[PDB]
């Protein structure tokens, strides 16, 4: 039992904005760990969303991710620019796509 199965190297410098609210929440205490958990992923957005408005321009990053079991209530969010914040997202589910549910990824940014 060490606390992840596999890395994940976040490149902040293509996804400044992300990347920034990935390593103040890491830095922050949020979990470093993505524990994969794609069917409740929606579930954990409603709950992480709550009472927080949109703004023109922007999506509510979360950290931890919905799509980790860690995410959901508690989860940090920020408002990031829609094309970091978009890039970003779709940049970690592709290289999160070779991980069955379950595993557990450690984030690390870079």
């Known amino acids: 039992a060490a606390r992840y199965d596999d890395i994940l190297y ?3 410098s293509r996804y400044p904005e ?3 609210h990935i390593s103040d929440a890491i830095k922050a205490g949020h979990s470093d760990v993505c524990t994969i958990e794609r069917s409740g992923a929606d579930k954990r957005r409603q ?3 709550k009472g927080i408005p949109t703004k023109p321009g ?3 990053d979360e950290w931890p991710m919905a799509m980790c079991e860690e995410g959901g209530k ?3 969010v920020r408002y990031v620019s829609s094309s970091d914040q978009r890039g ?3 940049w970690v589910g592709n290289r999160l796509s070779g991980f ?3 595993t557990r990824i450690l984030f690390i940014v870079q």
Do not use: K, Q, Y
Request: aromatic fraction near 10%; proline fraction near 5%; charged fraction near 20%.
């Open 10 to 12: 976040f490149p902040a």
């Open 18 to 20: 992300t990347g920034a």
């Open 47 to 49: 709950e992480s969303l």
């Open 58 to 60: 922007f999506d509510r």
């Open 74 to 76: 508690g989860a940090s």
């Open 88 to 90: 970003a997202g779709s």
């Open 100 to 102: 069955a549910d379950g």
